[PDB]
Ligand binder design. Sequence first.
Ligand SMILES: *Cc1cccc(C*)c1
Ligand SMILES: *Cc1cccc(C*)c1
Ligand SMILES: *Cc1cccc(C*)c1
Ligand SMILES: *Cc1cccc(C*)c1
Ligand SMILES: *Cc1cccc(C*)c1
Ligand SMILES: *Cc1cccc(C*)c1
Ligand SMILES: *Cc1cccc(C*)c1
Ligand SMILES: *Cc1cccc(C*)c1
Ligand SMILES: *Cc1cccc(C*)c1
Ligand SMILES: *Cc1cccc(C*)c1
Ligand SMILES: *Cc1cccc(C*)c1
Ligand SMILES: *Cc1cccc(C*)c1
Ligand SMILES: *Cc1cccc(C*)c1
Ligand SMILES: *Cc1cccc(C*)c1
Ligand SMILES: *Cc1cccc(C*)c1
Lengths: 7, 7, 7, 7, 7, 7, 7, 7, 7, 7, 7, 7, 7, 7, 7, 21, 21, 21, 21, 21, 21, 21, 21, 21, 21, 21, 21, 21, 21, 21
Amino acid sequence: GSVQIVY
Amino acid sequence: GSVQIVY
Amino acid sequence: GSVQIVY
Amino acid sequence: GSVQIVY
Amino acid sequence: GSVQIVY
Amino acid sequence: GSVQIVY
Amino acid sequence: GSVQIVY
Amino acid sequence: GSVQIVY
Amino acid sequence: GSVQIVY
Amino acid sequence: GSVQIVY
Amino acid sequence: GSVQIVY
Amino acid sequence: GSVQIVY
Amino acid sequence: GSVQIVY
Amino acid sequence: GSVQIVY
Amino acid sequence: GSVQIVY
Amino acid sequence: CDNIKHVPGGGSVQIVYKPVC
Amino acid sequence: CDNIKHVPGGGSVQIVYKPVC
Amino acid sequence: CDNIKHVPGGGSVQIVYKPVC
Amino acid sequence: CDNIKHVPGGGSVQIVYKPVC
Amino acid sequence: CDNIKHVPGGGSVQIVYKPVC
Amino acid sequence: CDNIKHVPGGGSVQIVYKPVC
Amino acid sequence: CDNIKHVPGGGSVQIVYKPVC
Amino acid sequence: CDNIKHVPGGGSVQIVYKPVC
Amino acid sequence: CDNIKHVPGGGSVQIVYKPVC
Amino acid sequence: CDNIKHVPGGGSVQIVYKPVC
Amino acid sequence: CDNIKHVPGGGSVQIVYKPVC
Amino acid sequence: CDNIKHVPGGGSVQIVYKPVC
Amino acid sequence: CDNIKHVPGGGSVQIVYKPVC
Amino acid sequence: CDNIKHVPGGGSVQIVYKPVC
Amino acid sequence: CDNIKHVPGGGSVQIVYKPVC
Ligand SMILES: *Cc1cccc(C*)c1
Ligand SMILES: *Cc1cccc(C*)c1
Ligand SMILES: *Cc1cccc(C*)c1
Ligand SMILES: *Cc1cccc(C*)c1
Ligand SMILES: *Cc1cccc(C*)c1
Ligand SMILES: *Cc1cccc(C*)c1
Ligand SMILES: *Cc1cccc(C*)c1
Ligand SMILES: *Cc1cccc(C*)c1
Ligand SMILES: *Cc1cccc(C*)c1
Ligand SMILES: *Cc1cccc(C*)c1
Ligand SMILES: *Cc1cccc(C*)c1
Ligand SMILES: *Cc1cccc(C*)c1
Ligand SMILES: *Cc1cccc(C*)c1
Ligand SMILES: *Cc1cccc(C*)c1
Ligand SMILES: *Cc1cccc(C*)c1
């Protein structure tokens, strides 16, 4: 249940 | 149940 | 349940 | 449950 | 539960 | 002509 | 013409 | 024409 | 026309 | 036309 | 193509 | 193409 | 293309 | 393209 | 392109 | 709201919760 | 809100919670 | 809010919680 | 808020909590 | 707030908590 | 409002009164 | 408001009264 | 307001009254 | 307000009255 | 306000009255 | 928004852009 | 926003851009 | 915002950009 | 903001940019 | 801000840039 954000 | 966001 | 943010 | 931020 | 910030 | 409010 | 409020 | 407030 | 407030 | 406040 | 406003 | 405003 | 304002 | 303001 | 202000 | 005329001629209670006007 | 005329002719209670106007 | 005319002719209580105007 | 006319003709209590105007 | 006219004609209590104006 | 393209090719007057966007 | 392109090609008057954006 | 491009190509008057942004 | 590009190419008058940004 | 680019190419008058930024 | 119960039971990303509440 | 209960049970990212509450 | 209960049970990142509350 | 309960149970990063509260 | 309870149970980084409270 992790979160990864890339722009 | 992870979240991955790419723009 | 970690968080990783990359711009 | 760690946090990593990269700009 | 550590925090790492990189600019 | 009065007003009474109760909750 | 008075007002009374109670909670 | 008075006002009374009670909580 | 007075005002009375009670908490 | 007085004011009375009580907490 | 001018604009004129009067109140 | 001027603007004129009058109140 | 000037502007004129009058109140 | 000047501006004139009058109150 | 000048500015004139009058109160 | 414009030109509202609230004259109940008695007791008045107005309870408005998070309006967006 | 513009030109509001609040004249209840009695007791008045106005409770407004987080308005955005 | 502009041109508000609050004249209840009695007791007045105004409770406003975090307005954004 | 502009041109507010608060004349209750009696007792007045105004409680404003963290307004942003 | 501009041109506010606070004339309750009685007792007046104003409690303002952390306003940002 | 997004991606608005206001190019009247003349005089332009925009009067917006209390928008909530 | 985002990505607004105001290019009237003439005189421009913008009067905005109490926006909440 | 973001990425606003105000280029009237003439005279520009901006009157903004109590914005909350 | 971010990334505002104010280039009227003429006279510029900005009157801002009590902004809260 | 960030990254503001004020280049009217003429006369510039900025009147800001009690900003809260 | 009141009494919101956000319990996805996993990863949660909330991106809210200029809300007016 | 009142009584919000944010318990994702995992990773949480909240990005809120210029809210007006 | 009142009575917020932020308990993600993991990593938490809150990025809030120019809120007006 | 009142009665905020921030207990992520992990790593916490709060980046708040020019709040007006 | 009142009655804030910041107990992440881990690492905490708070970066606040020009708040107006
Ligand atoms: C008509 C009206 C009543 C209360 C609040 C608003 C914003 C408007
Ligand atoms: C009409 C009105 C009542 C209370 C608050 C606001 C912002 C507006
Ligand atoms: C109409 C009004 C009442 C209370 C507070 C505000 C900002 C506006
Ligand atoms: C109308 C008003 C009442 C109280 C506080 C503010 C900022 C505005
Ligand atoms: C209208 C008003 C009342 C109290 C405080 C402020 C900043 C404004
Ligand atoms: C589209 C638009 C025009 C003026 C003001 C707002 C908030 C939006
Ligand atoms: C689109 C827009 C015009 C003027 C003011 C605001 C807040 C937004
Ligand atoms: C778009 C905009 C114009 C003027 C003032 C604000 C806060 C925003
Ligand atoms: C966009 C803007 C213009 C003037 C003042 C502020 C705070 C913001
Ligand atoms: C954008 C801006 C103009 C003038 C004053 C402030 C605080 C902000
Ligand atoms: C329900 C809700 C989510 C995010 C922002 C607001 C103001 C409200
Ligand atoms: C519900 C909510 C989320 C983030 C910011 C605000 C002002 C409200
Ligand atoms: C709910 C909330 C989150 C962040 C900032 C504010 C002013 C409010
Ligand atoms: C809820 C909140 C978070 C950060 C800053 C402020 C002023 C408020
Ligand atoms: C809630 C809060 C956080 C940081 C700074 C201020 C003024 C307020």
